[PDB]
Amino acid sequence: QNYGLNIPITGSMDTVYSNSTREEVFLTSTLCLYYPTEASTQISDGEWKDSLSQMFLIKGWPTGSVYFKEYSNIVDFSVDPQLYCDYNLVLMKYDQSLELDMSELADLILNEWLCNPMDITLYYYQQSGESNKWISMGSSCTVKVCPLNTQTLGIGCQTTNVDSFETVAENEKLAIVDVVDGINHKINLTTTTCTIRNCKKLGPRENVAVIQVGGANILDITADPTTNPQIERMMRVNWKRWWQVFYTIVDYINQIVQVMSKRSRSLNSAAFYYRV
Amino acid sequence: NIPITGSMDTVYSNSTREEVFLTSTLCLYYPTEASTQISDGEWKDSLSQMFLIKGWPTGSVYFKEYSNIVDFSVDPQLYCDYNLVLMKYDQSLELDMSELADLILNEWLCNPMDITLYYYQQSGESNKWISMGSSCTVKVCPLNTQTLGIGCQTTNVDSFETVAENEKLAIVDVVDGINHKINLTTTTCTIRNCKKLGPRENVAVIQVGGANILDITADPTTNPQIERMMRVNWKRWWQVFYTIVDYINQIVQVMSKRSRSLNSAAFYYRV
Amino acid sequence: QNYGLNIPITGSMDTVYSNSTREEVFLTSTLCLYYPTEASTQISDGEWKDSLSQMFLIKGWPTGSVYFKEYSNIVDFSVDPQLYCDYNLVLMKYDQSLELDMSELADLILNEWLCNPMDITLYYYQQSGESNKWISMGSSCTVKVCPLNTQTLGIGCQTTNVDSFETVAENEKLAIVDVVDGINHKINLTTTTCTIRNCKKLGPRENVAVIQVGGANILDITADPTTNPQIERMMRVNWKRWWQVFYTIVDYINQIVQVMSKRSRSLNSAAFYYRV
Amino acid sequence: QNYGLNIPITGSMDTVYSNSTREEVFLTSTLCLYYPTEASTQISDGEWKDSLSQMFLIKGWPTGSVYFKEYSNIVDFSVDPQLYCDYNLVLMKYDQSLELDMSELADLILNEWLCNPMDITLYYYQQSGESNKWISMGSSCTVKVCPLNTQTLGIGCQTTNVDSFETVAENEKLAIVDVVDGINHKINLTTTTCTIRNCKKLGPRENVAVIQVGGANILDITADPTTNPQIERMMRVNWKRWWQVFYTIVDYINQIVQVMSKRSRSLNSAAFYYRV
Amino acid sequence: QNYGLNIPITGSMDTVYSNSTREEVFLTSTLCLYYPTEASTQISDGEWKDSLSQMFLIKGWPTGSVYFKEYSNIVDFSVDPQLYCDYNLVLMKYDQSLELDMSELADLILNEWLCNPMDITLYYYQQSGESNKWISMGSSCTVKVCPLNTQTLGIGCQTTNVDSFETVAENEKLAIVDVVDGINHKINLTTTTCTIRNCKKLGPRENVAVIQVGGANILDITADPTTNPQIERMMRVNWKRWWQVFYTIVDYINQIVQVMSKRSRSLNSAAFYYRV
Amino acid sequence: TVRQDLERQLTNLREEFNSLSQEIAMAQLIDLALLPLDMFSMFSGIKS
Ligand SMILES: *[C@@H]1O[C@H](CO)[C@@H](O)[C@H](O)[C@H]1NC(C)=O
Ligand SMILES: *[C@@H]1O[C@H](CO)[C@@H](O)[C@H](O)[C@H]1NC(C)=O
Ligand SMILES: *[C@@H]1O[C@H](CO)[C@@H](O)[C@H](O)[C@H]1NC(C)=O
Ligand SMILES: *[C@@H]1O[C@H](CO)[C@@H](O)[C@H](O)[C@H]1NC(C)=O
Ligand SMILES: *[C@@H]1O[C@H](CO)[C@@H](O)[C@H](O)[C@H]1NC(C)=O
Ligand SMILES: *[C@@H]1O[C@H](CO)[C@@H](O)[C@H](O)[C@H]1NC(C)=O
Ligand SMILES: *[C@@H]1O[C@H](CO)[C@@H](O)[C@H](O)[C@H]1NC(C)=O
Ligand SMILES: *[C@@H]1O[C@H](CO)[C@@H](O)[C@H](O)[C@H]1NC(C)=O
Ligand SMILES: *[C@@H]1O[C@H](CO)[C@@H](O)[C@H](O)[C@H]1NC(C)=O
Ligand SMILES: *[C@@H]1O[C@H](CO)[C@@H](O)[C@H](O)[C@H]1NC(C)=O
Ligand SMILES: [Ca+2]
Ligand SMILES: [Ca+2]
Ligand SMILES: [Ca+2]
Ligand SMILES: [Ca+2]
Ligand SMILES: [Ca+2]
Ligand SMILES: [Ca+2]
Ligand SMILES: [Ca+2]
Ligand SMILES: [Ca+2]
Ligand SMILES: [Ca+2]
Ligand SMILES: [Ca+2]
Ligand SMILES: [Ca+2]
Ligand SMILES: [Ca+2]
Ligand SMILES: [Ca+2]
Ligand SMILES: [Ca+2]
Ligand SMILES: [Ca+2]
Ligand SMILES: [Ca+2]
Ligand SMILES: [Ca+2]
Ligand SMILES: [Ca+2]
Ligand SMILES: [Ca+2]
Ligand SMILES: [Ca+2]
């Protein structure tokens, strides 16, 4: 049996609101932070995890519910970001020249992706439509594509001479690459380090929220240029002191989780649905 | 303070722009960089004569130089009836500019704090602590219910956790409902327990440089863009001032008169 | 060629009509991409225009429809910009301190301007209303303005001592200068090199869509401080490879063109209507 | 005002019609003479500009309304003839061997042209039909076209061998080339000096009027060899002294503007078609 | 498609069946086989992948739809076994003293586990009920649990002495440890080389079936001592030759897939519950 | 490659056909339906 997917739910416009649920969502869910190593370095502590946990307890979350996680930086977190955890808040420090990789990480974790494998050395690969991308993750993802015409001969590049291949993203830990949809391609991607998946983009992973810490709003989650929507799960707070940032988070946690949702969680901590 | 009632079939009154121009005062705050680039000193008078054709009487436009953002943050007075504040944008000044904007655009009602004696909570969302002085260093130790520090010893000061250092202005929010012991530089820096009332309509902030960075709301979820936070693209301060004078009608018409019955006498430039 | 200018149209709401105009003084719609020369330098190619033409053919645009008009950089493109086409795209690589130049160029091309000559030597000049600006164009412009009075005595400046003047812009290829509307101004501007035009702002131009490539939303085309509205033609995209940028534009060209509009085109490729 | 939409105009047949508009055109428009350098040299003067302006004002043009412009000669003026003005007169001295140059200059200016751009080294080009030409302008245009059969193989030429190409205009400053319509072509022309544009002829340009000064009727502007109309805007004079030429023009300036009319495209009524 | 809600379906007990779906499950899914390296060692061949694939095709499975995945052995495969695939079969050569390890692996893979992190260093943990366990995975897991009083004092152990702590699992790759429910515990587990997760037992994972190639029925997936059931997906077979084992698999693959079924959590039906 | 690669061209044909279905007349389409099209007649209407 389905859960009732194709059955309508007749409601009403006079039923009275059921009462609050903040208490129950606190007592069930688990809040969870992803912060850079710079945060701990500037805090210069090591009971700060305990202090923040007790602050969250006073705010109304039971003890074993707030889990802190540490990543070296944005680009290195981008390599297979496994959100091992229920309500995800990714604190993310802005610095120049990280605009694109920061945006790519935000896209990857905010949206749900259905990823299939790709065998680069053997087959050519297209992109079906607007919602499909190629996501390449690893230690050194240099991607060089050669598009083929109707005659299986490359255009602007010969399939034999890899130098003529058009490089589309060099030396990123994560690269979400789009190419014109409907052309076969030959990819030269460094198979020892980097792995590349053909990923469709389903709806939004409406569980993880991204808190930018530095500059102006720049996260273009939608790769299409005509639209730059602003999701309520993309927050932006100025800063000088990481302690002030964490106190702001702890003080306003209720609003943040009210913005986020719990139902959109997956059994796997992976940030995509691998469908072989 | 009373129910005011009025029909919808009332006809419009004549435009009140003339009366507000002939009764109220506009007052600009600009950084000393502006004067330095201008390299003049009859420019104040020339700009006043230039405002006159726009409508303001001879004396109703008042210019008040300030050195820079960090120095203007300390206890900013607003001696006027329509205040414009020009804020140059530059890197690393984002939060200080946002803090100054949060201080002036919003209207705070607030009381003093005796840091050496008591422990101070934060009642709710509105209540912040405003630290102002030559150089503030707000160290805070949060206490458990047993009046013992968590992640800090109430006696030792090193274990305390800095939330703002070497700041001429610091608007700090701590976790609500937790007692706090502050160590704060009693000589240079005073600190005030301040609640956020409605908006201050008397003022308006022209950012002079970059992108949307002002965040008047300390909350992360909401980053609203109110009408009084303008931004203009600058390359010459003369061009900036010409723009402001030419479009003064819209700026003043986006501002509004202050509505808060204060009880603390202060100097105002009313004519 | 409308000349039933005044009399009104009538059109029903509940009916989709199968009758419609079939107007054609064309062969087909034509697209034209302006890009900085550094794009070519990074690409390090020279059949890449042909490859992009082939990929546009894949996306549906006929072969002779897409053109590429290289420009050296934003400031040098600002001097008498030309719209040689029907659907214009302009790629603009953002950099620090180029913000006002970039915004002024975007304002110039995006809006529609009605310009008149300005003989600085003989006459004083004025700005009648808010819609009127002065545009200085040339290889080297240095605008100095001395406002006058009713008595025609300079204020903050002597009418003859040019050094007493006030400089609103210097050493810019393009300068869209607004002065206070109502006061005569005596101008001093380097007549041998830079020209000045007294231009009113008509409605918006639609052939041009501006694809910013770098930083956050900073283009304030509207000289009014209060209003900073992000219209649908000021698109933005993050980047690290010009191949990625161009593939993005090719993939989403249909959305871009259906955001733009062919109708508001002009015979001459000048960015303004010069009425002598 | 319902721009960009053809709307029928219902006109009566017995409404008494308005009074004259000559006062309006004199007190509003701007007359705009173009004369060759030889005229000034023979006149041997240079207050003659002021003298003619006074003699114009006698007949009732405001002082700034008359606007004199000086061009070196026919062939060098024809390159990019930019008639940005309100009521243009163009004096063309006839001499032998300049028949086609004068004819193509008149063809270029008397009619409004919509010019799409061309990229010679990348595409092949066609002519839609009767009204589509290719207009080439520059310091030295030497356009060598050669046609292609349906198999993309040249006829009368080898595509790779430029020596086999069939030159159709050499070393002309302006060349309005018409080739056989419906045949793809490959072009070569000296891209550094001479530019070329695929130009379609719209209706006539009422703004301009060509006074041929010298010999008999030679201006066959219509590229069709059969029709050879003598449009009202192509006037002729017999001359010995440029003073006599200018005196005739000033004395009969009213009739000239009666022949001419305001540029239709420049009107507000043509806002959203090809306004110029 | 009305995801998330639990709507009550309704069906009639007199409707008729539908056509068999055997064709679809062969022609769309992907079969997936895990075997120990000793299999290939005894096979001593190496187009046997192709041979098995062609036999599967004869049974009805397209060529590219059957995957083989050699694993070293049970203990080293149990460390985070990721079955990113569509119809999973896991062969396991039973051996003495690996009874618990094999049963732990079977319990881990044959049921859907919802796992949250566990910060050993900071919190004290608990077990909500019989459906909760702690799975530890790594190169060498040595879990030492110290239960606590109601006043956070250990019983049978001191909270400061890992020597006094009681060892529950020692130096195994996979350890699904259960403890008393309702008693807080303090853990020490070698955090640099063995992660631990607090996991909850959802319904069964039909996607995967286990085949014990060796001895007698021992797999007790249910950690409860009382119930030691025999699930349909826990198959057993005797053996002397790996070729014979694989031929049996291929011959009866339709029956094995009938025993299994598509993962309940891989479908859009389970979208907003715990989809993965 | 992973399959044949004219499905893109078929998709373009579909996109144009769907909009092209509106410009069809009716009264003298029914007579075309009445007429027997055969192998000889069907494909003779190609463009060139
Ligand atoms: C739900 O909340 C309302 C809030 O007033 C309260 O009255 C009610 O008792 C609550 N429901 C239950 C079952 O207690
Ligand atoms: C990519 O090209 C390099 C060039 O040396 C080659 O070594 C490598 O094997 C290629 N990789 C793929 C996946 O084609
Ligand atoms: C207000 O406007 C009306 C018409 O708009 C005018 O008749 C009236 O005189 C105006 N009021 C005053 C005080 O002049
Ligand atoms: C802050 O700490 C210093 C030393 O840690 C101390 O001398 C000073 O009195 C403290 N501030 C206050 C207000 O007590
Ligand atoms: C469309 O216009 C034609 C005449 O132009 C008219 O006969 C017809 O009724 C109109 N309405 C339609 C086609 O729905
Ligand atoms: C601008 O000022 C200079 C003085 O340095 C003067 O020589 C020049 O003539 C002025 N320009 C014009 C157009 O008068
Ligand atoms: C036309 O003539 C009448 C009578 O002489 C006069 O009143 C009217 O103003 C004239 N029209 C114009 C446009 O001068
Ligand atoms: C035209 O032909 C000459 C050889 O006669 C060649 O050098 C030149 O590059 C050609 N021009 C173009 C634009 O290809
Ligand atoms: C079901 O299968 C039978 C033969 O196995 C076939 O004849 C029938 O058409 C199938 N049902 C449908 C709906 O095609
Ligand atoms: C576990 O005990 C060892 C000593 O045997 C100790 O070094 C280690 O820190 C303990 N682990 C944790 C997580 O405290
Ligand atoms: Ca290449
Ligand atoms: Ca990336
Ligand atoms: Ca794509
Ligand atoms: Ca976008
Ligand atoms: Ca500050
Ligand atoms: Ca501390
Ligand atoms: Ca607070
Ligand atoms: Ca905010
Ligand atoms: Ca500029
Ligand atoms: Ca001066
Ligand atoms: Ca102005
Ligand atoms: Ca603006
Ligand atoms: Ca030849
Ligand atoms: Ca010529
Ligand atoms: Ca022709
Ligand atoms: Ca002719
Ligand atoms: Ca013990
Ligand atoms: Ca084990
Ligand atoms: Ca248990
Ligand atoms: Ca059991």
PDB file of C-alpha atoms in Angstrom, chain E residues 44-205:
ATOM      1  CA  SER E  44      40.281 -19.043 -10.965  1.00  0.00           C
ATOM      2  CA  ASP E  45      38.831 -17.643 -14.188  1.00  0.00           C
ATOM      3  CA  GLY E  46      38.061 -14.035 -15.091  1.00  0.00           C
ATOM      4  CA  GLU E  47      35.639 -13.711 -17.880  1.00  0.00           C
ATOM      5  CA  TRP E  48      33.332 -15.311 -15.295  1.00  0.00           C
ATOM      6  CA  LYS E  49      31.819 -11.892 -14.671  1.00  0.00           C
ATOM      7  CA  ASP E  50      30.699 -11.906 -18.302  1.00  0.00           C
ATOM      8  CA  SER E  51      29.626 -15.555 -18.082  1.00  0.00           C
ATOM      9  CA  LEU E  52      27.423 -14.872 -15.064  1.00  0.00           C
ATOM     10  CA  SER E  53      26.061 -11.736 -16.726  1.00  0.00           C
ATOM     11  CA  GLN E  54      25.030 -13.665 -19.834  1.00  0.00           C
ATOM     12  CA  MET E  55      23.408 -16.383 -17.732  1.00  0.00           C
ATOM     13  CA  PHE E  56      21.492 -13.657 -15.905  1.00  0.00           C
ATOM     14  CA  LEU E  57      20.438 -12.295 -19.291  1.00  0.00           C
ATOM     15  CA  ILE E  58      19.097 -15.716 -20.243  1.00  0.00           C
ATOM     16  CA  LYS E  59      17.091 -15.616 -17.025  1.00  0.00           C
ATOM     17  CA  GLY E  60      15.902 -12.155 -18.121  1.00  0.00           C
ATOM     18  CA  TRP E  61      18.191  -9.519 -16.587  1.00  0.00           C
ATOM     19  CA  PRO E  62      19.655  -7.033 -19.144  1.00  0.00           C
ATOM     20  CA  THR E  63      23.426  -6.966 -19.503  1.00  0.00           C
ATOM     21  CA  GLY E  64      24.206  -3.754 -17.651  1.00  0.00           C
ATOM     22  CA  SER E  65      21.701  -4.342 -14.851  1.00  0.00           C
ATOM     23  CA  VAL E  66      23.601  -6.936 -12.764  1.00  0.00           C
ATOM     24  CA  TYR E  67      26.467  -5.806 -10.526  1.00  0.00           C
ATOM     25  CA  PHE E  68      29.147  -7.792  -8.700  1.00  0.00           C
ATOM     26  CA  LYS E  69      31.033  -6.462  -5.663  1.00  0.00           C
ATOM     27  CA  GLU E  70      33.830  -8.543  -4.171  1.00  0.00           C
ATOM     28  CA  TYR E  71      34.451  -7.964  -0.465  1.00  0.00           C
ATOM     29  CA  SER E  72      37.414  -9.228   1.526  1.00  0.00           C
ATOM     30  CA  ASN E  73      35.560 -11.016   4.335  1.00  0.00           C
ATOM     31  CA  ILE E  74      32.658 -10.713   6.753  1.00  0.00           C
ATOM     32  CA  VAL E  75      34.402  -8.820   9.538  1.00  0.00           C
ATOM     33  CA  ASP E  76      36.060  -6.237   7.284  1.00  0.00           C
ATOM     34  CA  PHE E  77      32.916  -5.844   5.149  1.00  0.00           C
ATOM     35  CA  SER E  78      30.691  -5.207   8.166  1.00  0.00           C
ATOM     36  CA  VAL E  79      32.463  -1.872   8.779  1.00  0.00           C
ATOM     37  CA  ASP E  80      29.856   0.490   7.315  1.00  0.00           C
ATOM     38  CA  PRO E  81      28.440  -1.707   4.523  1.00  0.00           C
ATOM     39  CA  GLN E  82      26.811   0.636   2.009  1.00  0.00           C
ATOM     40  CA  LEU E  83      24.277  -1.113  -0.234  1.00  0.00           C
ATOM     41  CA  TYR E  84      23.778   1.735  -2.708  1.00  0.00           C
ATOM     42  CA  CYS E  85      21.926  -0.509  -5.110  1.00  0.00           C
ATOM     43  CA  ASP E  86      18.492  -1.883  -6.020  1.00  0.00           C
ATOM     44  CA  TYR E  87      18.212  -5.642  -5.284  1.00  0.00           C
ATOM     45  CA  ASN E  88      20.951  -6.733  -2.894  1.00  0.00           C
ATOM     46  CA  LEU E  89      22.230 -10.255  -2.236  1.00  0.00           C
ATOM     47  CA  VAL E  90      24.960 -10.915   0.329  1.00  0.00           C
ATOM     48  CA  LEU E  91      26.671 -14.300   0.355  1.00  0.00           C
ATOM     49  CA  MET E  92      28.384 -15.203   3.625  1.00  0.00           C
ATOM     50  CA  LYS E  93      30.609 -18.241   4.124  1.00  0.00           C
ATOM     51  CA  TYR E  94      29.804 -19.269   7.683  1.00  0.00           C
ATOM     52  CA  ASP E  95      32.821 -20.098   9.825  1.00  0.00           C
ATOM     53  CA  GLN E  96      33.319 -20.990  13.463  1.00  0.00           C
ATOM     54  CA  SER E  97      33.711 -18.147  16.000  1.00  0.00           C
ATOM     55  CA  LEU E  98      32.178 -15.654  13.524  1.00  0.00           C
ATOM     56  CA  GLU E  99      28.627 -16.477  14.627  1.00  0.00           C
ATOM     57  CA  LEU E 100      28.114 -13.190  16.454  1.00  0.00           C
ATOM     58  CA  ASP E 101      29.916 -11.138  13.811  1.00  0.00           C
ATOM     59  CA  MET E 102      27.788 -12.610  11.029  1.00  0.00           C
ATOM     60  CA  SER E 103      24.605 -12.152  13.055  1.00  0.00           C
ATOM     61  CA  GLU E 104      25.556  -8.545  13.819  1.00  0.00           C
ATOM     62  CA  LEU E 105      26.151  -7.863  10.133  1.00  0.00           C
ATOM     63  CA  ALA E 106      22.838  -9.470   9.187  1.00  0.00           C
ATOM     64  CA  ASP E 107      20.990  -7.436  11.811  1.00  0.00           C
ATOM     65  CA  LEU E 108      22.693  -4.284  10.555  1.00  0.00           C
ATOM     66  CA  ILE E 109      21.880  -4.763   6.870  1.00  0.00           C
ATOM     67  CA  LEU E 110      18.490  -6.518   6.959  1.00  0.00           C
ATOM     68  CA  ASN E 111      16.736  -3.708   8.870  1.00  0.00           C
ATOM     69  CA  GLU E 112      16.382   0.032   8.375  1.00  0.00           C
ATOM     70  CA  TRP E 113      18.405   1.854  11.040  1.00  0.00           C
ATOM     71  CA  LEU E 114      17.844   5.509  11.948  1.00  0.00           C
ATOM     72  CA  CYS E 115      21.134   6.675  13.454  1.00  0.00           C
ATOM     73  CA  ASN E 116      21.977   9.896  15.303  1.00  0.00           C
ATOM     74  CA  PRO E 117      25.502  10.813  16.435  1.00  0.00           C
ATOM     75  CA  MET E 118      26.900  10.255  19.901  1.00  0.00           C
ATOM     76  CA  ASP E 119      29.419  12.695  21.371  1.00  0.00           C
ATOM     77  CA  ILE E 120      31.035  10.324  23.856  1.00  0.00           C
ATOM     78  CA  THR E 121      33.284  12.964  25.375  1.00  0.00           C
ATOM     79  CA  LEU E 122      30.488  15.329  26.449  1.00  0.00           C
ATOM     80  CA  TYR E 123      27.074  13.714  27.060  1.00  0.00           C
ATOM     81  CA  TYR E 124      25.881  10.698  29.031  1.00  0.00           C
ATOM     82  CA  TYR E 125      23.651   8.435  26.977  1.00  0.00           C
ATOM     83  CA  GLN E 126      20.591   6.270  27.423  1.00  0.00           C
ATOM     84  CA  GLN E 127      18.418   3.751  25.595  1.00  0.00           C
ATOM     85  CA  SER E 128      14.776   4.682  25.112  1.00  0.00           C
ATOM     86  CA  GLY E 129      13.562   1.130  24.628  1.00  0.00           C
ATOM     87  CA  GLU E 130      14.042  -2.288  23.103  1.00  0.00           C
ATOM     88  CA  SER E 131      14.148  -0.727  19.619  1.00  0.00           C
ATOM     89  CA  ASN E 132      17.276   1.329  20.412  1.00  0.00           C
ATOM     90  CA  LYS E 133      20.870   0.134  20.103  1.00  0.00           C
ATOM     91  CA  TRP E 134      24.344   1.632  19.739  1.00  0.00           C
ATOM     92  CA  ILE E 135      26.217   0.597  16.594  1.00  0.00           C
ATOM     93  CA  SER E 136      29.978   1.099  16.724  1.00  0.00           C
ATOM     94  CA  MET E 137      31.949   0.827  13.486  1.00  0.00           C
ATOM     95  CA  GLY E 138      35.636   1.260  12.779  1.00  0.00           C
ATOM     96  CA  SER E 139      38.969  -0.461  12.409  1.00  0.00           C
ATOM     97  CA  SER E 140      39.085  -1.430  16.102  1.00  0.00           C
ATOM     98  CA  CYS E 141      36.140  -0.805  18.435  1.00  0.00           C
ATOM     99  CA  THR E 142      36.559  -1.344  22.185  1.00  0.00           C
ATOM    100  CA  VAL E 143      33.409   0.024  23.815  1.00  0.00           C
ATOM    101  CA  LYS E 144      33.684   0.403  27.599  1.00  0.00           C
ATOM    102  CA  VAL E 145      30.381   1.392  29.214  1.00  0.00           C
ATOM    103  CA  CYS E 146      30.014   2.602  32.802  1.00  0.00           C
ATOM    104  CA  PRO E 147      26.374   2.741  33.956  1.00  0.00           C
ATOM    105  CA  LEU E 148      25.375   5.467  36.383  1.00  0.00           C
ATOM    106  CA  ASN E 149      23.175   5.991  39.412  1.00  0.00           C
ATOM    107  CA  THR E 150      20.270   8.414  39.462  1.00  0.00           C
ATOM    108  CA  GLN E 151      22.793  10.910  40.922  1.00  0.00           C
ATOM    109  CA  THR E 152      25.475  10.500  38.219  1.00  0.00           C
ATOM    110  CA  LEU E 153      27.691   8.135  40.223  1.00  0.00           C
ATOM    111  CA  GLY E 154      28.821   4.925  38.579  1.00  0.00           C
ATOM    112  CA  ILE E 155      27.761   1.481  39.777  1.00  0.00           C
ATOM    113  CA  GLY E 156      30.387  -1.194  39.308  1.00  0.00           C
ATOM    114  CA  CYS E 157      32.624   1.535  37.865  1.00  0.00           C
ATOM    115  CA  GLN E 158      34.063   4.939  38.701  1.00  0.00           C
ATOM    116  CA  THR E 159      33.334   7.772  36.290  1.00  0.00           C
ATOM    117  CA  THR E 160      37.043   8.709  36.166  1.00  0.00           C
ATOM    118  CA  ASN E 161      38.642   5.242  35.788  1.00  0.00           C
ATOM    119  CA  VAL E 162      38.446   3.594  32.381  1.00  0.00           C
ATOM    120  CA  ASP E 163      40.032   0.607  34.112  1.00  0.00           C
ATOM    121  CA  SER E 164      37.016   0.386  36.418  1.00  0.00           C
ATOM    122  CA  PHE E 165      34.737   0.709  33.366  1.00  0.00           C
ATOM    123  CA  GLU E 166      33.092  -2.510  32.132  1.00  0.00           C
ATOM    124  CA  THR E 167      33.994  -3.783  28.665  1.00  0.00           C
ATOM    125  CA  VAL E 168      31.004  -4.744  26.507  1.00  0.00           C
ATOM    126  CA  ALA E 169      32.675  -5.066  23.097  1.00  0.00           C
ATOM    127  CA  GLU E 170      36.359  -5.519  22.273  1.00  0.00           C
ATOM    128  CA  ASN E 171      38.337  -4.932  19.080  1.00  0.00           C
ATOM    129  CA  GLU E 172      35.666  -5.822  16.516  1.00  0.00           C
ATOM    130  CA  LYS E 173      34.831  -3.981  13.318  1.00  0.00           C
ATOM    131  CA  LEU E 174      31.080  -3.904  14.042  1.00  0.00           C
ATOM    132  CA  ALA E 175      29.497  -3.887  17.506  1.00  0.00           C
ATOM    133  CA  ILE E 176      25.725  -3.490  17.923  1.00  0.00           C
ATOM    134  CA  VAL E 177      25.719  -3.112  21.702  1.00  0.00           C
ATOM    135  CA  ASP E 178      22.603  -3.059  23.858  1.00  0.00           C
ATOM    136  CA  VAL E 179      22.501  -2.092  27.530  1.00  0.00           C
ATOM    137  CA  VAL E 180      19.886  -1.667  30.237  1.00  0.00           C
ATOM    138  CA  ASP E 181      17.137   0.737  29.207  1.00  0.00           C
ATOM    139  CA  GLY E 182      16.513   3.740  31.435  1.00  0.00           C
ATOM    140  CA  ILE E 183      19.992   3.891  33.012  1.00  0.00           C
ATOM    141  CA  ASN E 184      22.341   6.677  31.985  1.00  0.00           C
ATOM    142  CA  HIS E 185      25.699   5.449  30.708  1.00  0.00           C
ATOM    143  CA  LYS E 186      29.135   6.966  30.204  1.00  0.00           C
ATOM    144  CA  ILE E 187      31.032   5.495  27.263  1.00  0.00           C
ATOM    145  CA  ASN E 188      34.671   5.346  26.321  1.00  0.00           C
ATOM    146  CA  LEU E 189      35.359   4.215  22.757  1.00  0.00           C
ATOM    147  CA  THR E 190      38.727   5.038  21.219  1.00  0.00           C
ATOM    148  CA  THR E 191      37.242   7.905  19.232  1.00  0.00           C
ATOM    149  CA  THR E 192      40.092   8.227  16.723  1.00  0.00           C
ATOM    150  CA  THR E 193      39.331   4.861  15.076  1.00  0.00           C
ATOM    151  CA  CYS E 194      35.750   3.795  15.889  1.00  0.00           C
ATOM    152  CA  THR E 195      32.691   5.966  15.415  1.00  0.00           C
ATOM    153  CA  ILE E 196      29.529   5.135  17.351  1.00  0.00           C
ATOM    154  CA  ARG E 197      25.921   5.989  16.551  1.00  0.00           C
ATOM    155  CA  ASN E 198      22.734   5.845  18.606  1.00  0.00           C
ATOM    156  CA  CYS E 199      20.366   3.982  16.290  1.00  0.00           C
ATOM    157  CA  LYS E 200      16.664   3.171  16.259  1.00  0.00           C
ATOM    158  CA  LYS E 201      15.038   0.132  14.660  1.00  0.00           C
ATOM    159  CA  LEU E 202      12.501   0.946  11.961  1.00  0.00           C
ATOM    160  CA  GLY E 203      10.722  -1.671   9.866  1.00  0.00           C
ATOM    161  CA  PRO E 204      12.604  -4.328   7.925  1.00  0.00           C
ATOM    162  CA  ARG E 205      14.844  -3.628   4.944  1.00  0.00           C
TER     163      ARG E 205
END
